[PDB]
């Protein structure tokens, strides 16, 4: 029943940003690949994703998310959101590539509820 927010930022300089966030949260990234890095932060509970943008001058929000523990949680979330009247798109186990629900806010900000 626990979850944590996911904050995905599109950054102009991945290397600079990896350094900054390591110092900010006091821990190194969990995964680094060309073009992206992930941090799993304990306090505050957070999944931080850094995506190389390079074709822009300043950091911008890429997407937002809620990372849940299992497939059953994604299902419950999907049903609750749909019941609430939100327009949702869902991909889930009945084995899925990824168990996930997508919704978008009125200002265009995209949200995803998912399992790692």
CA distances from 91 to 18, 47, 57, 102 (A): 31, 21, 34, 9
For residue 91, give the CATH number of its domain. Answer: 3.10.180.10
For tokens 């900054």, the residue is: 20
Binding site annotation covers 63? yes
Element containing residue 10 per DSSP (H, E): strand 3-11
Resolution value in angstroms: 2.0
The alpha helices in the chain, defined as continuous H runs, are 14-25, 71-83
Q: Is 73 annotated as a binding residue?
A: no
- 69 and 113 Cβ atoms separated by less than 8 Å: no
Which domain does 46 fall in, by range?
Answer: 1-116
> How many domains is the chain built from?
1
Strands 100-104 and 46-52, bridge-based pairing: unpaired
Within 8 A by CB and 6+ apart from 75, the residues are 92
Q: Is 62 annotated as a binding residue?
A: yes
């Amino acid at each position: 029943h626990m979850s944590r927010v996911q904050l995905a930022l599109r950054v102009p300089d991945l290397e600079a940003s990896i350094g900054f966030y390591s110092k900010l949260f006091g821990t190194g990234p969990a995964k680094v690949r060309p073009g992206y890095a992930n941090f799993a932060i304990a306090e505050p509970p957070l999944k931080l994703v850094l995506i190389e943008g390079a074709g822009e001058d300043a950091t911008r929000l890429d997407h937002l998310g809620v990372e849940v523990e299992d497939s059953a949680q994604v299902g419950h979330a999907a049903r609750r959101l749909k019941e609430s009247g939100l327009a949702t798109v869902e991909e889930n186990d009945t084995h899925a590539f990824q168990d996930k629900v997508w919704v978008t806010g009125p200002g265009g900000e995209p949200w995803e509820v998912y399992v790692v």
